[PDB]
Amino acid sequence: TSLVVPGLDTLRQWLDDLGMSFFECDNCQALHLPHMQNFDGVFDAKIDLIDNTILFSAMAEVRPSAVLPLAADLSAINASSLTVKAFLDMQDDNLPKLVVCQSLSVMQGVTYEQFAWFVRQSEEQISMVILEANAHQLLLPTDD
Amino acid sequence: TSLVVPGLDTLRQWLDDLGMSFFECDNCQALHLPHMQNFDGVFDAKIDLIDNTILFSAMAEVRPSAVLPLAADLSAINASSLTVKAFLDMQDDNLPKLVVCQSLSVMQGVTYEQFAWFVRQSEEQISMVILEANAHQLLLPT
Amino acid sequence: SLVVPGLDTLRQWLDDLGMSFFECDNCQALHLPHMQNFDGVFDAKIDLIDNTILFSAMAEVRPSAVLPLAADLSAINASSLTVKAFLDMQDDNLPKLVVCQSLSVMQGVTYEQFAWFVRQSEEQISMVILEANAHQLLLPT
Amino acid sequence: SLVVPGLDTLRQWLDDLGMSFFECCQALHLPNFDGVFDAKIDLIDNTILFSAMAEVRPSAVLPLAADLSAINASSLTVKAFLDMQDDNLPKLVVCQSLSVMQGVTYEQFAWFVRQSEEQISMVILEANAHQLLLP
Ligand SMILES: [Cl-]
Ligand SMILES: [Cl-]
Structure with a gap:
């Protein structure tokens, strides 16, 4: 596999990939x-x-x-x-914001499937945290 | 707490809550x-x-x-x-489909907090099976 | 009486x-x-x-x-x-077939919910294993 | 090599x-x-x-x-x-994770250690400097 120190251009095409x-x-x-x-x-x-x-x-x-x-x-x-x-x-x-985040260190290079797995595992854990807070009626609706 | 035998009207009202x-x-x-x-x-x-x-x-x-x-x-x-x-x-x-399910019996009743925790644990645990299966390239996208 | 049972609570419930x-x-x-x-x-x-x-x-x-x-x-x-x-x-x-059911008790359960859990468990589990035993898939006990 | 490591591979990696x-235990405690x-x-x-x-x-x-x-x-x-x-007593936990589901290299783990030690000690240094911890 490739091991890239990804720039902003690298993340742009990886996402479209x-x-x-x-x-x-x-x-x-x-x-x-x-x-x-x-x-x-x-x-x-x-x-x-x-x-x-x-x-x-x-x-x-x-x-x-x-x-x-x-x-x-x-x-x-x-x-x-x-x-x-x-x-x-x-x-x-x-308004008070609830920031939920996850980080991937790319100092020593990462592979494309490392970044892929990082995104969807992030949007699964971030999903479960925010969805649980909305179940507790802690957040404001996103629509009018 | 209220111990109810829910209908499909109870569930969607609970989902709204x-x-x-x-x-x-x-x-x-x-x-x-x-x-x-x-x-x-x-x-x-x-x-x-x-x-x-x-x-x-x-x-x-x-x-x-x-x-x-x-x-x-x-x-x-x-x-x-x-x-x-x-x-x-x-x-x-x-196409062949993978079914990931979770089950909760209500014939002897259920409270709101029991149903809430059921949905929470189901959505977490099911999503991990789906997330891991997708990591091993076993699924088609949507 | 919504309880988060311990193993001692499960022992007393099976005795009841x-x-x-x-x-x-x-x-x-x-x-x-x-x-x-x-x-x-x-x-x-x-x-x-x-x-x-x-x-x-x-x-x-x-x-x-x-x-x-x-x-x-x-x-x-x-x-x-x-x-x-x-x-x-x-x-x-020897290869084993595990047939099971689960009841999460994180937010509590009643003695009546546990009583039906074990009865529905024994019914549904037995009907699986006995049919596999009727298909000549299991060893004798 | 890109590897999904066990605990023993982390043991040898700390050796390296x-x-x-x-x-x-199941963790690897450090001094x-x-x-x-x-x-x-x-x-x-x-x-x-x-x-x-x-x-x-x-x-x-x-x-x-x-x-x-x-x-x-x-x-x-x-x-x-x-x-x-x-x-x-109330404990403060300062953690950094490196997910490994799709493998990891040895320098990704080595930098993960260096980065966490400097980032964790920066949090511990600040809380203790503000008289929030016990000796
Ligand atoms: Cl912002
Ligand atoms: Cl066993």
Whole structure:
């Protein structure tokens, strides 16, 4: 197999090699995945390449009355999975966001099937975490 | 807690309380779950109610190249999980399908928290079988 | 009375149902000798792992029948809404057919839910093994 | 070679890097950065886990729990959470995982160790610097 230190161009074609539809604004660096927006509660998901590391991250908006209970359950959520990470991103002017992410290190090179397996295992664990929080009525709906 | 014998109206109301979208061909006796079909491999998943038994089942199309290795792997797949079940459905006009299901008996009643945990554990454990089977290139995409 | 049962709760529940069980010093499973009256059933036990109750029965498969039995494992599993069947094969063991059902108790169960779990287990498990025994796929006990 | 390693392959891989482990368990425990009372390597469901545990002083459980989100967002690869049982003191778990379902190389594992040690010790160094852990 090949072992690539993948650039942004490498991830763009690898995703199309997997049939994954992606989106990217003009001067930006994130590769947004609209396929992740069919999971209930998922407002946005994107692939990022920072410091030789791939970051599959999805974002869900927390109900303001659920912020404290969800914050207390972050350790149990992070312990529920061997790969997924969950934390609260809360800004003054924004609504509280639940960021769920998983990282793949590409410093020493990765293979295409390593990246493929990483994406779908990420979008399975991220799916189960966000879908479980929406089952607890902790998130806001993604539609009007 | 309330210990109920649920009907198909109880389940979809419970699914609504869980924020789970369900689609129902009014020709269909089951509650189809579109959230489960974005897992690559799964082409359909549904919640059924037959003889006081709730059936969370997901179906994936198997590559004809892999029905023999997958059939030999059914024992290790079923033994890999305490709750889920996995088998093949092979007719003659349609492609072979892998069925991954989980079962919950309701004839002696069930609470809301028991059903919620059933759906949660079913969706996790089924998706891992589908995710791993797709990693071994045993399934057709959707 | 929604309880998250321990193994001691399972022992007392089987006694309330008049169902004899057997448990060693070393182990942790509650073997049920009543299931051994069914032809081909070598052993049946109740386990409790990861907040899940596991009623499983085991049958020794004839070596010449291993491939045919494996072939219609899918049909056996599709034959019921609750039963699970698979093959257990080690290098020093005779091949085994494991027929089992599971009831997760993570969020609690009632004594009535457990009573029906074991009765539906014994019915569905026996009808699988006895039909495989009627197809000349199992060894005598 | 791209390999799905067992525990023995991880044993030999730690041998190749000059890193010692404790003989035993199912993890490979490893033997300074004050706060941590145990660090180990786990192999669970085709996933290698490098985790370190530090006992939290009860006077800091609520503050540290409030900072868990900022701690997890400060790192690209490491995860932090609390493990609180009724008979133990509250523990802080700092972990980084390397999934291995589709194999792994030896330098992918070697860099996984180097990256986790520097990222885990960066979390443990900061919490202990803020008087959140026990000696
Ligand atoms: Cl963001
Ligand atoms: Cl056994």
